[PDB]
Coordinates of C-alpha atoms in Angstrom, one line a residue:
Chain N
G1 CA -16.7 -48.6 22.1
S2 CA -19.4 -47.8 19.6
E3 CA -18.1 -44.2 19.3
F4 CA -14.5 -45.0 18.0
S5 CA -15.4 -44.4 14.4
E6 CA -16.9 -41.0 15.0
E7 CA -14.1 -40.3 17.6
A8 CA -11.4 -40.9 14.9
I9 CA -13.2 -39.1 12.1
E10 CA -13.7 -35.9 14.1
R11 CA -10.0 -35.7 15.0
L12 CA -9.0 -36.0 11.3
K13 CA -11.5 -33.3 10.3
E14 CA -10.1 -31.0 13.0
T15 CA -6.6 -32.0 11.8
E16 CA -7.5 -31.1 8.1
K17 CA -8.5 -27.7 9.3
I18 CA -5.4 -27.3 11.5
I19 CA -3.0 -28.0 8.6
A20 CA -4.6 -25.3 6.4
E21 CA -4.3 -22.9 9.3
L22 CA -0.7 -24.0 9.9
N23 CA -0.1 -23.3 6.3
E24 CA -1.5 -19.9 6.5
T25 CA 0.6 -18.9 9.5
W26 CA 3.7 -19.5 7.4
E27 CA 2.3 -17.8 4.3
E28 CA 1.6 -14.8 6.6
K29 CA 5.1 -14.9 8.0
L30 CA 6.8 -14.9 4.5
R31 CA 4.5 -12.1 3.3
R32 CA 5.4 -9.5 6.0
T33 CA 9.0 -10.7 5.8
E34 CA 9.1 -9.9 2.1
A35 CA 7.3 -6.6 2.7
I36 CA 10.0 -5.6 5.2
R37 CA 12.4 -6.3 2.3
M38 CA 10.0 -4.1 0.2
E39 CA 10.8 -1.4 2.9
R40 CA 14.5 -2.2 3.2
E41 CA 14.8 -2.0 -0.6
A42 CA 13.4 1.5 -0.4
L43 CA 15.7 3.0 2.3
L44 CA 18.7 1.8 0.3
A45 CA 17.8 4.6 -2.1
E46 CA 14.8 6.5 -0.7
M47 CA 15.9 9.8 0.9
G48 CA 18.7 9.0 -1.5
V49 CA 22.5 8.7 -2.0
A50 CA 24.7 11.2 -3.7
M51 CA 27.5 9.6 -5.7
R52 CA 31.0 10.8 -6.5
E53 CA 32.2 10.8 -10.1
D54 CA 34.4 7.8 -9.4
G55 CA 31.2 6.0 -8.1
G56 CA 31.9 6.8 -4.4
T57 CA 29.1 6.9 -1.9
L58 CA 28.9 10.6 -1.3
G59 CA 26.0 11.6 0.9
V60 CA 22.6 11.3 2.5
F61 CA 19.5 13.4 1.8
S62 CA 17.1 13.8 4.6
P63 CA 13.7 12.1 4.0
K64 CA 11.5 14.1 1.6
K65 CA 8.1 13.2 3.0
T66 CA 8.3 11.5 6.4
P67 CA 8.9 13.7 9.6
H68 CA 12.2 13.5 11.4
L69 CA 14.8 14.7 13.9
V70 CA 18.2 16.0 13.1
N71 CA 20.7 15.9 15.9
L72 CA 22.2 19.3 16.7
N73 CA 25.1 18.3 19.0
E74 CA 28.4 19.5 17.6
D75 CA 30.9 16.6 17.7
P76 CA 30.7 13.4 15.6
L77 CA 31.3 11.3 18.7
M78 CA 27.5 10.6 18.9
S79 CA 26.7 7.0 19.9
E80 CA 23.4 8.6 18.9
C81 CA 22.2 8.9 15.4
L82 CA 22.6 12.1 13.4
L83 CA 19.1 11.5 12.1
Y84 CA 16.1 9.8 13.7
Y85 CA 12.8 8.8 12.2
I86 CA 9.4 9.7 13.5
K87 CA 7.6 6.9 11.8
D88 CA 3.8 7.1 11.7
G89 CA 2.4 5.5 14.9
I90 CA 4.1 5.8 18.2
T91 CA 7.8 6.5 18.7
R92 CA 9.2 6.0 22.3
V93 CA 12.2 7.9 23.7
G94 CA 14.2 7.0 26.8
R95 CA 16.8 4.8 28.4
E96 CA 18.4 1.4 27.7
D97 CA 17.0 -0.7 30.5
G98 CA 14.1 -2.2 28.7
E99 CA 11.3 -2.4 31.3
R100 CA 9.4 -1.0 28.3
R101 CA 11.3 -0.9 25.1
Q102 CA 12.4 2.4 23.6
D103 CA 12.7 3.3 19.9
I104 CA 15.2 6.1 20.6
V105 CA 17.5 5.3 23.5
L106 CA 19.6 8.2 24.7
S107 CA 22.4 8.7 27.2
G108 CA 22.3 11.2 30.0
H109 CA 21.8 11.8 33.7
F110 CA 18.5 13.6 32.9
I111 CA 16.9 11.2 30.4
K112 CA 14.2 9.2 32.2
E113 CA 13.6 5.5 31.7
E114 CA 10.6 6.6 29.6
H115 CA 11.2 10.2 28.5
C116 CA 8.7 11.3 25.9
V117 CA 6.7 9.8 23.0
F118 CA 6.0 11.0 19.5
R119 CA 2.7 10.1 18.1
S120 CA 2.2 10.3 14.4
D121 CA -1.1 10.2 12.6
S122 CA -2.2 10.4 9.0
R123 CA -5.9 9.5 9.7
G124 CA -6.9 11.9 6.9
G125 CA -4.7 10.3 4.2
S126 CA -3.0 13.8 4.0
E127 CA 0.0 15.1 5.9
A128 CA 1.1 13.3 9.0
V129 CA 0.2 15.0 12.3
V130 CA 3.0 14.7 14.9
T131 CA 2.4 15.4 18.7
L132 CA 5.1 15.5 21.4
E133 CA 3.7 13.9 24.5
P134 CA 6.1 14.4 27.4
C135 CA 6.2 12.0 30.3
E136 CA 5.8 12.8 33.9
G137 CA 9.1 13.9 35.6
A138 CA 10.8 14.2 32.2
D139 CA 12.2 17.6 31.1
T140 CA 11.6 18.3 27.4
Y141 CA 11.8 21.7 25.8
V142 CA 10.3 22.8 22.6
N143 CA 11.8 26.2 21.5
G144 CA 13.1 26.9 25.0
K145 CA 9.7 26.3 26.5
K146 CA 9.1 23.4 29.0
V147 CA 6.3 21.2 27.7
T148 CA 4.2 19.0 30.1
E149 CA 1.2 18.3 27.9
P150 CA 0.9 17.0 24.3
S151 CA 1.5 19.5 21.5
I152 CA 1.6 19.6 17.7
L153 CA 5.1 19.9 16.4
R154 CA 5.9 22.1 13.4
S155 CA 8.8 22.1 11.0
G156 CA 11.8 23.9 12.6
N157 CA 10.8 23.3 16.3
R158 CA 13.8 22.9 18.6
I159 CA 13.5 20.0 21.1
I160 CA 15.7 19.6 24.1
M161 CA 15.6 16.4 26.1
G162 CA 17.1 16.2 29.6
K163 CA 20.2 18.4 29.6
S164 CA 22.1 16.7 26.9
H165 CA 20.1 16.4 23.7
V166 CA 19.0 19.1 21.3
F167 CA 17.1 18.5 18.1
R168 CA 15.6 20.1 15.1
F169 CA 12.1 18.7 14.2
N170 CA 11.5 18.7 10.5
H171 CA 8.2 17.9 8.7
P172 CA 8.9 18.2 5.0
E173 CA 5.4 17.5 3.7
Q174 CA 3.9 19.8 6.3
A175 CA 6.3 22.6 5.2
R176 CA 5.6 21.7 1.6
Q177 CA 1.9 22.6 2.2
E178 CA 2.1 25.6 4.5
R179 CA 4.8 27.3 2.3
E180 CA 3.5 26.4 -1.1
Chain W
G1 CA -8.1 -60.3 7.1
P2 CA -9.3 -57.4 4.9
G3 CA -10.8 -55.6 8.0
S4 CA -7.4 -56.0 9.8
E5 CA -5.5 -54.9 6.7
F6 CA -7.7 -51.7 6.4
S7 CA -6.8 -50.8 10.0
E8 CA -3.1 -51.3 9.2
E9 CA -3.5 -49.3 6.0
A10 CA -5.2 -46.3 7.6
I11 CA -2.8 -46.1 10.5
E12 CA 0.3 -46.0 8.2
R13 CA -1.4 -43.1 6.5
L14 CA -1.5 -41.1 9.7
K15 CA 2.2 -41.8 10.4
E16 CA 2.9 -40.6 6.9
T17 CA 0.9 -37.4 7.6
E18 CA 2.9 -36.8 10.8
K19 CA 6.0 -37.0 8.6
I20 CA 4.4 -34.7 6.0
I21 CA 3.7 -32.1 8.7
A22 CA 7.2 -32.4 10.1
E23 CA 8.4 -32.0 6.4
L24 CA 5.9 -29.1 6.1
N25 CA 7.3 -27.3 9.2
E26 CA 10.7 -28.1 7.8
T27 CA 10.6 -26.6 4.3
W28 CA 8.7 -23.6 5.3
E29 CA 11.3 -22.7 8.0
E30 CA 13.9 -23.3 5.4
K31 CA 12.3 -20.9 2.9
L32 CA 11.8 -18.5 5.8
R33 CA 15.5 -18.8 6.8
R34 CA 16.6 -18.1 3.2
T35 CA 14.3 -15.2 2.7
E36 CA 14.9 -13.4 6.0
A37 CA 18.6 -13.5 5.3
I38 CA 18.2 -11.4 2.1
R39 CA 16.5 -8.8 4.4
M40 CA 19.3 -9.1 6.9
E41 CA 21.9 -8.7 4.1
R42 CA 20.2 -5.5 2.9
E43 CA 20.1 -4.5 6.6
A44 CA 23.8 -5.2 6.6
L45 CA 24.3 -3.1 3.5
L46 CA 22.3 -0.3 5.3
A47 CA 24.5 -0.5 8.4
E48 CA 27.6 -0.1 6.1
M49 CA 25.8 2.9 4.6
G50 CA 25.3 4.3 8.2
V51 CA 21.7 3.5 9.0
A52 CA 20.9 2.5 12.6
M53 CA 18.8 -0.6 13.2
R54 CA 17.5 -2.6 16.1
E55 CA 17.2 -6.4 15.5
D56 CA 13.4 -6.7 15.1
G57 CA 11.6 -4.1 13.0
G58 CA 14.9 -2.5 11.9
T59 CA 15.1 1.2 10.8
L60 CA 15.9 3.9 13.5
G61 CA 17.9 6.5 11.7
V62 CA 21.4 7.7 10.5
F63 CA 24.6 7.9 12.4
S64 CA 27.3 10.4 12.0
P65 CA 30.4 8.6 10.7
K66 CA 33.1 7.6 13.2
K67 CA 36.0 7.0 10.8
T68 CA 35.2 9.1 7.8
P69 CA 35.6 12.9 7.4
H70 CA 32.3 14.5 6.4
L71 CA 30.3 17.7 6.1
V72 CA 27.3 18.2 8.2
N73 CA 24.7 20.7 6.7
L74 CA 23.7 23.3 9.1
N75 CA 21.0 24.8 6.8
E76 CA 17.6 24.4 8.4
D77 CA 15.1 24.3 5.5
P78 CA 13.4 20.8 5.3
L79 CA 13.2 21.0 1.5
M80 CA 16.7 22.0 0.6
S81 CA 18.4 20.6 -2.4
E82 CA 21.7 19.7 -0.7
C83 CA 22.4 16.6 1.4
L84 CA 22.2 16.5 5.2
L85 CA 25.6 14.6 5.2
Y86 CA 28.4 14.6 2.6
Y87 CA 31.3 12.4 3.0
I88 CA 34.9 13.5 2.3
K89 CA 37.0 10.6 1.2
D90 CA 40.2 9.8 -0.6
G91 CA 40.9 11.8 -3.7
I92 CA 38.9 14.8 -4.9
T93 CA 35.4 16.0 -4.1
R94 CA 34.0 18.9 -6.1
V95 CA 31.6 21.6 -5.1
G96 CA 29.6 23.8 -7.5
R97 CA 26.4 24.0 -9.6
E98 CA 24.4 21.5 -11.6
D99 CA 24.0 23.5 -14.8
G100 CA 27.7 23.9 -15.6
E101 CA 28.8 21.2 -18.0
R102 CA 31.6 19.8 -15.9
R103 CA 30.1 17.4 -13.4
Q104 CA 30.0 18.5 -9.8
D105 CA 29.9 15.9 -7.0
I106 CA 28.5 18.2 -4.4
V107 CA 25.9 20.6 -5.7
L108 CA 25.0 23.9 -4.1
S109 CA 22.0 26.0 -5.2
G110 CA 21.8 29.8 -4.9
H111 CA 23.0 32.8 -6.9
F112 CA 26.5 33.0 -5.3
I113 CA 28.0 29.6 -6.0
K114 CA 30.3 29.4 -9.0
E115 CA 30.2 26.5 -11.5
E116 CA 33.3 25.2 -9.9
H117 CA 33.5 26.7 -6.4
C118 CA 35.9 24.7 -4.4
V119 CA 37.6 21.2 -4.3
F120 CA 38.1 18.9 -1.4
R121 CA 41.3 16.9 -1.3
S122 CA 41.9 14.0 1.1
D123 CA 45.3 12.3 0.9
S124 CA 46.3 9.3 2.9
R125 CA 49.6 7.4 2.5
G126 CA 50.1 4.0 4.1
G127 CA 49.6 6.4 7.0
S128 CA 45.9 5.9 7.2
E129 CA 44.9 9.2 8.8
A130 CA 43.4 11.5 6.2
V131 CA 44.8 15.0 5.7
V132 CA 42.0 17.1 4.3
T133 CA 42.7 20.3 2.5
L134 CA 40.2 22.6 0.9
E135 CA 41.1 24.2 -2.4
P136 CA 39.3 27.4 -3.4
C137 CA 38.5 28.1 -7.1
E138 CA 39.2 31.6 -8.3
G139 CA 36.3 34.1 -7.8
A140 CA 34.6 31.8 -5.3
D141 CA 33.8 32.8 -1.8
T142 CA 34.6 30.2 0.8
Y143 CA 35.3 31.1 4.4
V144 CA 36.6 28.7 7.0
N145 CA 35.9 29.7 10.6
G146 CA 35.3 33.3 9.3
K147 CA 38.7 33.4 7.4
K148 CA 38.5 33.7 3.7
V149 CA 40.3 30.7 2.1
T150 CA 42.2 31.9 -0.9
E151 CA 44.7 29.1 -1.2
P152 CA 44.8 25.4 0.0
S153 CA 44.3 25.1 3.7
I154 CA 44.1 22.2 6.2
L155 CA 40.7 21.5 7.7
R156 CA 40.3 20.4 11.3
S157 CA 37.4 18.9 13.1
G158 CA 35.0 21.5 14.2
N159 CA 35.7 23.9 11.4
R160 CA 32.9 26.0 10.1
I161 CA 32.8 26.2 6.2
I162 CA 30.6 28.8 4.5
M163 CA 30.0 28.9 0.8
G164 CA 28.7 31.8 -1.2
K165 CA 28.0 33.5 2.1
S166 CA 24.9 31.3 2.3
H167 CA 25.7 27.6 2.8
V168 CA 26.9 26.5 6.2
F169 CA 28.6 23.2 6.9
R170 CA 30.4 21.8 9.9
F171 CA 33.5 19.8 9.0
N172 CA 34.2 16.8 11.2
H173 CA 37.2 14.5 11.2
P174 CA 36.4 11.9 13.9
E175 CA 39.8 10.3 13.4
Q176 CA 41.8 13.5 13.7
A177 CA 39.8 14.3 16.8
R178 CA 40.8 11.0 18.6
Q179 CA 44.5 11.8 17.8
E180 CA 43.8 14.6 20.3

C-alpha cells in the first residue's frame, strides 16, 4: 500500500478543518444564547415596571415602539394573554394542534388550525409596517369588516377572530409619526 | 525499532486527540448548560412578572393576573402615560399626579386629577382573600359603575372605575370571582 501515507495525512488535514468548524458551531451557539439574554434582560425592564413606594411590583406599560395587541375580553379568566407581541417578521395565529406551530394559540369553536398571520416589516429602517393576512376559511374582522385579503393595520384597529376574540391593534411608533 | 516506535508514538497522539475532542464537546456543552440556565432564570423571573413564553424563542406577551386584584386600563391611546395593567396588592396604593411633592404610586395625567386623588386599600387576614376598598380623597371625582364614591366602598370584579371623568379602568378580582 504505497498510498497509506497520503491516505493518513489527508484525513488528518480534513480533521484539522473539522475541529475548527466544530469549535465555531459552539461559539455560534453561545453567541445567540447570550443575545437572547440580551433580549431577556431588556423585557425585564423595557416597556417597564411601575413600583409602589414600599418597592412593590406595581404595573406594566405597553411597549413604546413595537406594535402589539391588547385583549379586549372583559374577564381576567383569560388563559390568553392580556397583551400579545407583533414582533417583526411573521406572527402565526391559530390552534394548539401543531401541524404547523402557532405563535398565538387561541381557544374557540371558530378559530381555525391556522387562522391568520401578521407580517411585520421595517425594510426602510423606519416605522414597522404590519399587514393582517387572513387565511382561507378563517373569519377575521377589522373594525367590523370581514377581511379576506392582506391589509395594512393602523393604530386603533379592532380585530375580531372567530367569534370569541376581540383585540385592539396598537402601533405606537406609527402613531408617534402620524400624530406628531 | 525507531520506525516502529514512531508508529506507536503517532497513534497514541490520535487517541489523545479523540479524548481532546470528547473533552471539547464536554466543556462546551457545560458552558452552554450554565449560560442557557441564566436565560431560563430570567425567563423564570419574567413568568413570575406575568410574561408568556413558549419554550424555544420565548416571548409571547402578558397575561392578566389570575390571583391578584388589578386595574385594566381601558384608555385607547397607544402613547399614554399610564400603565396598561396596575396591580392592587396588600396595603395602600395611591392615585394622583407626579408634580405634587408627596409621591404617588399610580400617576394619572390630565387637568382633573387632584394631587392625591384616591387610595386603594387591600386587607387580607390569615383569610387570604383580599377585600379591596377604594378611598376617595376630598374634592376628587371618582365614580364606580356610574356611582360617585364619596366614602370607602368595596370593589368587586367587573367594576368600572372612572377618575377625573377621563380615566377608565376595569377592576378585576380573579379570586373574588371564583368564590362565585
